[PDB]
Amino acid sequence: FELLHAPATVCGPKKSTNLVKNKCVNFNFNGLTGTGVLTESNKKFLPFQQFGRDIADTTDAVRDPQTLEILDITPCSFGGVSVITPGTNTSNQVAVLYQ
Amino acid sequence: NTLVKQLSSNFGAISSVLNDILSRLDPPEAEVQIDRLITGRLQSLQTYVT
């Protein structure tokens, strides 16, 4: 058997759940997993296609095998943690800065 | 764009996404492929910083 070469039609003993949006939860479409926020996308695909890449050769949007809609994938891993302190001699207070 | 093309390569394996290799190979047996991906990315980081 092959892996990630054709739309799902066999699979196994795995029941399907519901669809949640605006959340950075895990997803699985035709065996391909990942992590990202499922939002709306104005771009449309093709009837004889399924997956979709981009300039960075990454999975940005995958067609749902039930609703047949377009949902863009946006990972929430975007940001940093910083802290600015005036020194331990002046005062013992800091300020958390978000990147 | 050079570092973007390196992430999609296999570096002697069969896939590039870490969530795809672990879903098909167990960690006790996939250790021979994860080490090649980490080492194959450290060469691009040392070349980019140079």
């Binding site: 981009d54 960075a56 990454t58 990972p75 975007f78 940093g80 990147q99 | 570092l3 973007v4 992430l7």
Partner: peptide
């Protein structure tokens, strides 16, 4: 609108990645 001269404004018109670890 900006505090620049006509020469500085003329040369100004001529002159996804962070998800992979390429922050700017």
């Amino acid at each position: 609108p900006s505090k620049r001269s006509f020469i500085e404004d003329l040369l100004f018109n001529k002159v996804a990645q962070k998800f992979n670890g390429l922050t700017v």
